Design a binder for this molecule. Structure first.
Ligand SMILES: CO[C@H]1O[C@H](CO)[C@@H](O)[C@H](O)[C@@H]1S[C@H]1O[C@H](CO)[C@@H](O)[C@H](O)[C@@H]1O
Length: 737
């Protein structure tokens, strides 16, 4: 059975600075691959390295880039050409068309119209095989570009080989950072030249300069194929050479089949039926996007043991390491998806985080490849605790716990999003103030409270001393400190204790991150009942929620000085202020379940699934964010969502397919049957779980892991009685206390 046929790596490529439809590039790679490969249409340095509307390809590039904002590192490219040997990135570029392009996760092909050359590529985890099909020509070449900001290249003719290293990065690297690469051709060089600051030097073997490059060449007959075996390493040339062996002796067809098998192995863990082709394509493209980041950042030594270059301290050390993810995005449902369907993989990732802490002094928040300043919160605590509570346990729980405590009272001296910016005010006053020069203060406060609840959960589980447990139980309630009774919204609060004025609910940024108060007010994952109480009860709560959808999308952008794409994305979708591409609001619709109106969530979730995701190049409604926006769809299409990682609960939505089957790593399977599902029947009239009536608005992780059958009776009218009782409600902290 093949699922790769539904994956579109182009989904999200039709994006611009002004309006994101995903901001993705076609990642031709193995799952979680250390090195990704992509056609490059953008100029060197530009975060928009591949765009759907672009006319020309200027290289095939090794990339590690998680997003256009964060940008890239460990990057170099290769380009076949004919005619004059040219290195210039504009001069070597070739028109192409998407009808002359085939992109799959395991295999990429394109016809380059200006050189009359076909390029195919098939990667493994750290290596890749290229096959160039040349026209008849006395002057055919391959350009190797090591990129600028300091690089190295050397041609070795007696091995049909080029080696080099690239260093161009976007920050977050140690001073000795280098990516070492090796390229082996199956055809002898009849022409050879290295390049130095734009200058072509024939028969000069080596360059160590700002922007190194090489061009090798030969005569070709019509349709003649030249294969190039490539691998790189963050450790050394010798390790790069060892990484090369992932290719074995395979040709393009054999490596493509191995990558296809590898993708079907992970995609096939979730089988959906009874939908249309749009839905299959959206679902598996999203699942594909959910299995890329964080990437592996470790390599295998001669004994088959994991070692890694440390992007934190620049040493080479034993053990796992992963990178290129921002937890501010991915704590929400991406990592939870790993804990449900790919726990053995997240196990390696958690071990990697322990090593991050040991190597750097801090758990990461945004890492790429080392600590990077972007976004807010201490949501690493959610990642670590959710894994642990779900049976994904690192060996070194002492270091895990100490690292968490450390993160609650330090901030990284160079990277203000690593650790807790404002921890002194927060620990003392119960919030980060609005007038002490700490931007996004309300967003930090809300996420810290949830983060502190996660720590509370683990402290309690570990039976820490009662006063530790009590400290975090108290801090978990810190969200109350920003609640403004008058507006029923979260509000920036001055150091003296007065709420800030004038208060502007529609103002983006400033007190909040990537949105306004209407977006952030719902960020109380661990205590929705507490928020409902704050608002004066479930009826007023629902009224506030309903108004999010019903109001105009007016906004105040003074904080940014322009209509940033996130604001524009909200305005065009016609869902009031519900900006689905904004991460803070992505769990919000599920909160209708905690107020006793799950039918409202059923309505709105199907609206989002039907309207905010399409399978084309412009497929997302905003940034894909390293699996978060994709895993949202994967979960939601199945019919449930981890509103609160750190609990064992998935809050019920409404399934998209007639049947979904989950194959867990433990050998059990869960079948979700919704035979009467359709475009019109999106309400849950009733539900059963292994024969037992199920009226609760949540499923438990442990129950799912035992496997069996859920039966969902779909209907075109809401059931106003189902899931309204107190015993039907998912977890809230104030109910436990
Ligand atoms: C610097 O760009 C960031 O901020 C500007 C606003 O100042 C945003 O408009 C832009 O989208 C990004 S935030 C963007 O990128 C982050 C890193 O990839 C990601 O974590 C976040 O969710 C968002 O997608």
């Amino acid at each position: 059975k093949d699922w790769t046929q539904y994956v579109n790596p182009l989904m999200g490529s039709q994006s611009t600075f002004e309006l994101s439809t995903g901001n993705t590039y076609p990642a031709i790679a193995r799952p979680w691959g250390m090195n990704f490969w992509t056609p490059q249409t953008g100029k060197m340095g530009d975060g928009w390295q591949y765009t759907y509307t672009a006319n020309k390809i200027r290289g095939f590039k090794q990339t590690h880039q998680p997003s256009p904002w964060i940008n890239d590192y460990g990057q170099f490219s290769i380009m076949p050409i004919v005619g004059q040997p040219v290195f210039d990135e504009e001069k070597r570029a070739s028109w192409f068309a998407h009808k002359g392009e085939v992109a799959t996760p395991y295999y990429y092909k394109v016809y380059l119209a200006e050189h009359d050359i076909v390029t195919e590529m098939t990667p493994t985890e750290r290596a890749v095989l290229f096959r160039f099909t040349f026209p008849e020509n006395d002057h055919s070449y391959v350009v190797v570009d090591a990129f600028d900001k300091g690089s190295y290249i050397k041609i070795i003719p007696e091995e049909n080989k080029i080696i080099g290293y690239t260093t161009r990065n976007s920050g977050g690297v140690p001073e000795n950072f280098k990516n070492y690469f090796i390229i082996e051709f199956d055809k002898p060089f009849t022409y050879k030249a290295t390049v130095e600051n734009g200058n072509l030097q024939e028969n000069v073997a080596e360059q160590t300069t700002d922007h190194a490059g090489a061009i090798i060449g030969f005569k070709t007959r019509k349709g003649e194929q030249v294969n190039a075996r490539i691998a790189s390493s963050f450790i050394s040339f010798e390790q790069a050479a060892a990484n090369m062996n992932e290719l074995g002796k395979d040709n393009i067809e054999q490596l493509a089949q191995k990558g296809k098998d590898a993708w079907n192995q992970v995609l096939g863990k979730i089988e959906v039926e009874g939908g249309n082709l749009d839905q299959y394509r959206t679902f598996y493209s999203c699942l594909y996007r959910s299995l890329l980041f964080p990437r592996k950042f470790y390599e295998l030594d001669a004994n088959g043991q994991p070692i890694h270059y440390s992007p934190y301290n620049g040493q080479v050390l034993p053990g796992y390491m992963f990178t290129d993810t921002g937890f501010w995005d991915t704590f929400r449902c991406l990592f939870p998806l790993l804990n449900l369907m790919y726990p053995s993989v997240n196990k390696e990732m958690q071990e990697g985080l322990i090593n991050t802490y040991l190597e750097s002094g801090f758990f990461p928040e945004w890492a790429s490849p080392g600590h990077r300043g972007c976004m807010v919160g201490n949501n690493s605590a959610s990642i670590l605790v959710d894994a642990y509570m779900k049976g994904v346990k690192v060996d070194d729980i002492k270091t895990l716990y100490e690292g968490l405590i450390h993160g609650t009272e330090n901030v990284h001296p160079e990277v203000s999003s690593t650790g807790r910016l404002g921890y002194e005010y927060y620990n003392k006053l119960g919030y980060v103030p609005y007038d002490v020069k700490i931007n996004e203060n309300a967003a930090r406060t809300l996420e810290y409270a949830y983060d502190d609840w996660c720590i509370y959960r683990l402290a309690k589980e570990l039976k820490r001393p009662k006063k530790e447990i009590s400290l975090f139980a108290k801090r978990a309630m810190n969200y109350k400190n920003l609640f403004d009774k008058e507006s029923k919204l979260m509000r920036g609060r001055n150091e003296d204790g007065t709420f800030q004025s004038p208060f502007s609910p529609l103002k983006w940024g400033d007190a909040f991150t990537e949105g306004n108060s209407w977006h952030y007010t719902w960020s109380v994952f661990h205590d929705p009942q507490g928020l409902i109480d704050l608002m004066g009860g479930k009826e007023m709560f629902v009224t506030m929620m309903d108004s999010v959808f019903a109001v105009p999308p007016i906004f105040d952008d003074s904080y940014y000085g322009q209509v940033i794409h996130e604001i524009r994305e909200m305005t065009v979708m016609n869902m009031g202020n519900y900006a689905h591409g904004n991460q803070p609001i992505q769990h919000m619709i599920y909160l209708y379940d905690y107020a006793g109106q799950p039918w409202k969530a059923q309505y709105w979730l199907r609206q989002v699934m039907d309207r905010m995701y399409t399978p084309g190049p412009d497929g997302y409604c905003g940034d894909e964010d390293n699996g978060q926006t994709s895993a949202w769809y994967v979960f939601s299409a199945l019919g449930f969502y981890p509103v609160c990682p750190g609990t064992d609960e998935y809050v019920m939505g409404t399934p998209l397919f007639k049947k979904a089957t989950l194959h867990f790593e433990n050998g059990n399977s869960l079948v979700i049957d919704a035979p009467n599902n359709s475009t019109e029947n999106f309400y849950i009239d009733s539900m059963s779980f292994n024969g037992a009536d199920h009226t609760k608005n949540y499923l438990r992780h442990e129950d799912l892991f035992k496997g069996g059958t859920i039966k969902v009776d779909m209907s075109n009218r809401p059931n106003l009685n189902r899931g309204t009782k107190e015993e039907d409600m998912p977890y809230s902290f104030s109910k436990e206390l």
